[PDB]
Design an enzyme around this catalytic site. Structure first.
Site, PDB file in Angstrom:
ATOM      1  N   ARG A 234      80.279  25.279  36.839  1.00 50.58           N
ATOM      2  CA  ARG A 234      80.920  25.770  38.081  1.00 50.58           C
ATOM      3  C   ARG A 234      80.439  24.917  39.250  1.00 50.58           C
ATOM      4  NH1 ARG A 234      83.419  29.998  40.841  1.00 50.58           N
ATOM      5  NH2 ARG A 234      82.393  30.608  42.820  1.00 50.58           N
ATOM      6  N   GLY A 235      81.383  24.456  40.062  1.00 47.13           N
ATOM      7  CA  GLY A 235      81.105  23.727  41.319  1.00 47.13           C
ATOM      8  C   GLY A 235      81.431  24.700  42.451  1.00 47.13           C
ATOM      9  N   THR A 236      80.548  24.779  43.428  1.00 45.40           N
ATOM     10  CA  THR A 236      80.750  25.620  44.592  1.00 45.40           C
ATOM     11  C   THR A 236      79.936  25.103  45.796  1.00 45.40           C
ATOM     12  OG1 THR A 236      80.892  27.917  45.308  1.00 45.40           O
ATOM     13  CG2 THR A 236      79.006  27.340  43.951  1.00 45.40           C
ATOM     14  N   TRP A 237      79.939  25.845  46.884  1.00 42.48           N
ATOM     15  CA  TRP A 237      79.257  25.483  48.100  1.00 42.48           C
ATOM     16  C   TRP A 237      78.287  26.548  48.440  1.00 42.48           C
ATOM     17  CZ3 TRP A 237      79.971  20.749  50.195  1.00 42.48           C
ATOM     18  CH2 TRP A 237      81.021  19.992  49.652  1.00 42.48           C
TER      19      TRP A 237
ATOM     20  N   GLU B 103      76.093  36.609  42.366  1.00 41.78           N
ATOM     21  CA  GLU B 103      77.437  36.336  42.911  1.00 41.78           C
ATOM     22  C   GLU B 103      78.252  37.590  43.196  1.00 41.78           C
ATOM     23  OE1 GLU B 103      79.313  33.376  43.849  1.00 41.78           O
ATOM     24  OE2 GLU B 103      80.278  35.191  44.605  1.00 41.78           O
TER      25      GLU B 103
ATOM     26  N   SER C 293      83.970  32.472  38.199  1.00 44.13           N
ATOM     27  CA  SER C 293      84.812  31.667  37.296  1.00 44.13           C
ATOM     28  C   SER C 293      84.075  30.369  36.982  1.00 44.13           C
ATOM     29  CB  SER C 293      86.123  31.331  38.045  1.00 44.13           C
ATOM     30  OG  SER C 293      86.823  30.332  37.332  1.00 44.13           O
TER      31      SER C 293
ATOM     32  N   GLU D  83      88.788  28.448  30.989  1.00 46.79           N
ATOM     33  CA  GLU D  83      88.142  29.322  31.958  1.00 46.79           C
ATOM     34  C   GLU D  83      87.437  30.523  31.352  1.00 46.79           C
ATOM     35  OE1 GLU D  83      90.827  30.451  35.108  1.00 46.79           O
ATOM     36  OE2 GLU D  83      89.145  31.075  36.376  1.00 46.79           O
TER      37      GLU D  83
HETATM   38  N1  LIG Z   1      84.911  26.896  40.915  1.00 51.00           N
HETATM   39  C1  LIG Z   1      85.380  27.380  42.053  1.00 51.00           C
HETATM   40  N2  LIG Z   1      84.812  26.985  43.186  1.00 51.00           N
HETATM   41  N3  LIG Z   1      86.390  28.191  42.067  1.00 51.00           N
HETATM   42  C2  LIG Z   1      87.032  28.672  40.823  1.00 51.00           C
HETATM   43  C3  LIG Z   1      88.501  28.852  41.042  1.00 51.00           C
HETATM   44  C4  LIG Z   1      89.075  29.669  39.843  1.00 51.00           C
HETATM   45  C5  LIG Z   1      90.442  29.176  39.514  1.00 51.00           C
HETATM   46  N4  LIG Z   1      90.939  29.528  38.216  1.00 51.00           N
END
Ligand SMILES: N=C(N)NCCCCN
Length: 215
Positions: A94-97, A114, A119, A166
């Site tokens: 997972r990539g996020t900020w 979280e 996701s 996913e």
């Molecule tokens: N990895 C995220 N930042 N977002 C996930 C988005 C989910 C879209 N199916």
């Protein structure tokens, strides 16, 4: 974290792996799942997650109105459906900020909570797609790429969707940090799924707000 850092695989190979995961997902099913539940999950991955996750992260949902009631119903329906879908255990990404102010405090053994759904994808190529653009915010954010060891909580939704491979968690998922590597522009964090009730004598933080969560 070289699974993340290394170059992406070809479209062909990534599309193939996503298709195989979708197939494995369907094959691993469930009979109790409703039409409204299947439909909520399909919508989730494309757009529904945007509204649900905003609702889950909101400081003040008394302001949402009729739309709040719809968001609660949607979340309840998505969580209900998840529990009926096949579990996934193994590694996901997972990539996020994340707020730099939180990142600066983090050590191995800390637990991240979280508040939204979580996701993840089994394909680091797909994960990296969702954190390309820097969001605009009052807050100084930094890109975080998670390598997630999943031994609970994760259900594949790839059977009901998509080349995203996913795997989804219900809101409030807890992740224990196992490794951190900090660089300029990218922090990599290894985490393992943990049960909230088993978290003892460590520090928990809300991954979105950066606030401590009570022991
Ligand atoms: N990895 C995220 N930042 N977002 C996930 C988005 C989910 C879209 N199916």
């Amino acid at each position: 974290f070289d699974a993340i850092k290394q170059p992406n695989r070809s479209e062909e190979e990534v599309t193939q792996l996503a298709e195989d995961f979708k197939d494995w997902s369907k094959a691993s099913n469930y009979s109790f799942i409703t039409a409204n539940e299947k439909e909520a999950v399909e919508d989730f991955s494309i757009s529904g997650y945007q509204t649900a996750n905003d609702y889950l992260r909101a400081t003040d949902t008394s302001t949402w109105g009729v739309a709040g009631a719809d968001a609660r119903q949607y979340i309840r329906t998505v969580k209900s459906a998840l529990n009926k879908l096949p579990k996934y255990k193994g590694t996901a990404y997972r990539g996020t900020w994340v707020k730099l102010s939180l990142l600066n405090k983090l050590e191995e053994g800390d637990v991240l909570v979280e508040p939204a759904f979580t996701s993840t994808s089994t394909l680091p190529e797909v994960a990296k797609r969702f954190s390309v653009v820097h969001p605009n915010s009052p807050q100084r954010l930094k890109r975080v790429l998670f390598e997630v060891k999943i031994n609970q909580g994760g259900h594949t939704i790839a059977g009901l969707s998509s080349k995203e491979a996913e795997v989804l968690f219900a809101p409030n998922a807890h992740f224990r940090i196992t490794q951190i590597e900090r660089t300029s522009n990218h922090t990599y964090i290894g985490v393992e799924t943990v049960k909230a009730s088993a978290v003892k004598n460590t520090q928990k933080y809300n991954l979105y707000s950066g606030e401590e969560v009570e022991a």
